[PDB]
Write a protein that binds this ligand. Sequence first.
Ligand SMILES: CCCCCCCCCCCCCCC(=O)O[C@H](COC(=O)CCCCCCCCCCCC)COP(=O)(O)O
Lengths: 431, 49
Amino acid sequence: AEVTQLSNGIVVATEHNPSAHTASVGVVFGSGAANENPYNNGVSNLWKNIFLSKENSAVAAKEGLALSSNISRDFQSYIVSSLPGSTDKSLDFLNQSFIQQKANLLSSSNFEATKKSVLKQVQDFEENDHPNRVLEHLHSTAFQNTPLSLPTRGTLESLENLVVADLESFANNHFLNSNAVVVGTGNIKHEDLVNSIESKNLSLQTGTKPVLKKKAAFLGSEVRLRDDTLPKAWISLAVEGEPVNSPNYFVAKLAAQIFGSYNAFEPASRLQGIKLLDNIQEYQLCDNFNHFSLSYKDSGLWGFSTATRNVTMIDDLIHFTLKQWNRLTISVTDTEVERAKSLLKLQLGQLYESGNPVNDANLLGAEVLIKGSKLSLGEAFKKIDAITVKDVKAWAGKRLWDQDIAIAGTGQIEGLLDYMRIRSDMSMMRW
Amino acid sequence: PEHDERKRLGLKTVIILSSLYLLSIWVKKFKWAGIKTRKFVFNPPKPRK
Ligand SMILES: CCCCCCCCCCCCCCC(=O)O[C@H](COC(=O)CCCCCCCCCCCC)COP(=O)(O)O
């Protein structure tokens, strides 16, 4: 369980694990949805699809190879999965028709059948997936007129005005040699991957992608999409957070574990050691909530997201939650810090030590593009054990005490009050 | 006989109440800024609900 980087001109990272039964080989680029303009939006969502299109995936299934991809902010990936005695066939699939001869994939009939399939995925997303299209509007209203707000799927009219000339224009500027990391996880040695790459002269050409005119900036705002024919209400709310390679990275994750997540229909979820659950369950204010801490290379977001069916007591759920956030500055206790230490080490252990080599290839590729090297699970555990009560109160008085918020909501949100009745709840006025 | 005493307490009350009246106009316009700049877009729904 140790990571090895070795740059011969191309960065190659690999974590061997000889108790695995499969092996993944792919390439991860360092340009995501936060490297686009508002007219070619969601053009990386058309590069994932045509890699998974039916004529391209029929060729891979004839050698026992599975394809997988993922589009986010700040990175994308294209993974090829196989059996551990067959990884040399995995490099030859990435070399042909994605790197070298990538012209036959961009036909006129293969592109037109693909675009009308991506046009119906985003249309069904906009009408059915309500807790996830509200979290998208939270990024759209907090970082407006700034790169970090464009949706990773694109929009329905930015997807329609997209021709085949736009994809090679995106690939020429972003799929370069220095903006790239080649990953391999699972049952594969580090030295058999390096020799098999330099058994040929696998490379790319130019490097030095464009340099991202406007920086990221947080703005206090709100957006309301009321729909009275939906049976619920969904609401997200956040403040500014801690970015990647920030010195308060683990301190913001420990603070969200203090309040955690909840499900009203699970019996063991109702018995958690969270002080907010005493006010929630007396009048049954919600169905579920969850606290998060997102982090990027520019900034972050710290907050929570809920879904309720009590549409006349919405303003009590917002009042009681924002009152408990005040206690991280004034009156947090030592048994709440020690409980969140144990649960954070279990949550970090199930994300970084799962059984899917496709999952560990997106995690390894991001941390080597943005830092150059990987941080161990033993070193992250040593950092979490050294947080005190003073560090949480120093972080909380800087980041959430009397600060601006961003709100987003849909459904039966008539009982949601306006901005200044919610903004004033970010300081208890008892200290 | 209260004439000279009256106009001296009328000076203190008018100075105090004019600086309270000017500050309430500033305070009101700060708390009313989010309502005056609120926007509204209408897209007609698809018609078979
Ligand atoms: C409940 C009674 C309400 C009175 C309504 C006032 C109507 C205006 C007419 C002025 C008559 C008041 C006499 C003041 C006075 O002689 O003080 C004078 C001068 O002091 C002042 O300027 C007081 C300013 C008055 C503004 C009151 C602030 C309003 C905040 C709430 C107050 C109600 C609880 C006495 O001065 P001195 O006692 O220091 O010698």
